[PDB]
């Protein structure tokens, strides 16, 4: 059994590597010791677009948001491709695959955004840029407080010092949550999650021997993830209520 | 590599099933009396059309408006599916919009063929079936909307594609680097090259005794273009004649420019 959990851990890490171009290791390397272009106020953002070839650019506050929606839609596709490698996922009922992705992408998006944040800012644009936390906060209400709860989560989450090999298994666990509303067949889902939890537990024990109950502590963060998503939806229900193009709004439904 | 193209074919098929609730497989089981599905109520005339409400302006306007609601829903589905085509969401955003703007019709009339035979067309997710002759008896010019779509469907349906074939083909259609106004033609053409390569292998494996089916399928892109032009010129007549009637905003933003 233990050899099997090592094998599963290795398979997931390989898939994560093929699926996510900017890994946590690569991001920490950029945030520590080339280097990214920095956006810290209104002036460095005008320059930042000249320089960085933004794929999302057709007012300041909404334009940064739309780019966050752009990259998030890109992230969905990366997570979806990763999910397919999780053993048993593709044998699940199709509707349930869709249901698991739909309710899980937001949680995985904020998990992986933390790999790319520190207390001072967040990498953007595949790490070519770095946008400070102060400039984000300084955005007019209600735009200057959607990334702030993200940062505060990332601070605490990053203090657990997970690497990519850890996150690969953790992300699979989130996807295989048997309590998403509207699932048809919870068995194989909760069955696969049991195997993944067993592998994450062994991974954390071998990779962080001195970090007692890191397994438990990481589980406790899934609580914080659910809380942030529900609070994010509440802001999304207002950016779709305060700020008011048909084809574009169709691409960025949800 | 063939193994990689097979994986692309599987990906698109799997995403196609997730995006389009009413497949060709389900439509044919409804139209050919199979017992996996149910028989449609058939609308011929004012009398059945009126019984169709109690089972599923004026007549011709009401059919047109409902057909417009359906086009909007299809545009929503085709949008979801496009985001699944690898590389699509990584393209410049203005081009994504452009690829959907010119793409959705060619795809709509492709998938509308799945819902047709020579005698009429499934409606309301297959619960209903409206005849080709009733659609032509509609007053001018609403009676001319549907007939060219029937003529294409009859020829297109003789290729005998199933949903796995269609999924790659509609992907090829979205990723056309000759759409007007595109900014970065090259990355769009790089993706279509893989899509075309995947469709080629898919057609050879799924239809091994169907020679030049790949060529024959690319050739229908000609018939698709003509349907769109005709359809647009027909919508311009109603815009000048029924100044009380409104096009849905998603639809009007597609036809603009
Ligand atoms: C792994 C991952 C998942 C989701 C997201 C999506 O979340 C964000 C938030 C802030 C900036 C960016 C980068 N792109 C951008 N946004 N604004 N300008 N460039 C993305 C990023 C990574
Ligand atoms: C409930 C209902 C469903 C379908 C129809 C009509 O059948 C369809 C079905 C799908 C696409 C199109 C597009 N064809 C078109 N667009 N504008 N004019 N013709 C026509 C009428 C009522």
Curated annotation (Swiss-Prot), chain B:
Annotated control of activity: PDPK1 activates its transcriptional activity independently of its kinase activity.
One of the record's GO cellular component terms: RNA polymerase II transcription regulator complex
Induction conditions: (Microbial infection) Expression increases when incubated with M.tuberculosis or its lipoprotein LpqH; induction is TLR2-dependent (at protein level).
Coarse class of the protein's main subcellular location: nucleus
Mutation effect (residue 70 to H): In colon cancer; sporadic; somatic mutation; partial loss of ligand-binding
Record keywords, A-Z: Activator, Biological rhythms, Cytoplasm, Diabetes mellitus, Disease variant, DNA-binding, Glycoprotein, Isopeptide bond, Metal-binding, Nucleus, Obesity, Phosphoprotein, Receptor, Transcription, Transcription regulation, Ubl conjugation, Zinc, Zinc-finger
Effect upon mutating residue 18 to R: More than 50% loss of ubiquitination
Processing after translation: Phosphorylated in basal conditions and dephosphorylated when treated with the ligand. May be dephosphorylated by PPP5C.
Cross-link position per record: Glycyl lysine isopeptide (Lys-Gly) (interchain with G-Cter in ubiquitin): 18
9aaTAD (motif): residue ranges: 249-257
Disease: Defects in PPARG can lead to type 2 insulin-resistant diabetes and hyptertension. PPARG mutations may be associated with colon cancer.
Family designation: Belongs to the nuclear hormone receptor family. NR1 subfamily.
Subunit note: Interacts with FOXO1 (acetylated form). Heterodimer with other nuclear receptors, such as RXRA. The heterodimer with the retinoic acid receptor RXRA is called adipocyte-specific transcription factor ARF6. Interacts with NCOA6 coactivator, leading to a strong increase in transcription of target genes. Interacts with coactivator PPARBP, leading to a mild increase in transcription of target genes. Interacts with NOCA7 in a ligand-inducible manner. Interacts with NCOA1 and NCOA2 LXXLL motifs. Interacts with ASXL1, ASXL2, DNTTIP2, FAM120B, MAP2K1/MEK1, NR0B2, PDPK1, PRDM16, PRMT2 and TGFB1I1.
Role this protein plays: Nuclear receptor that binds peroxisome proliferators such as hypolipidemic drugs and fatty acids. Once activated by a ligand, the nuclear receptor binds to DNA specific PPAR response elements (PPRE) and modulates the transcription of its target genes, such as acyl-CoA oxidase. It therefore controls the peroxisomal beta-oxidation pathway of fatty acids. Key regulator of adipocyte differentiation and glucose homeostasis. ARF6 acts as a key regulator of the tissue-specific adipocyte P2 (aP2) enhancer.
Name of the molecule in the record: Peroxisome proliferator-activated receptor gamma
Organism the protein comes from: Homo sapiens
Lineage per the UniProt record: Eukaryota, Metazoa, Chordata, Craniata, Vertebrata
Residues of the full protein shown: 235 to 503 of 505
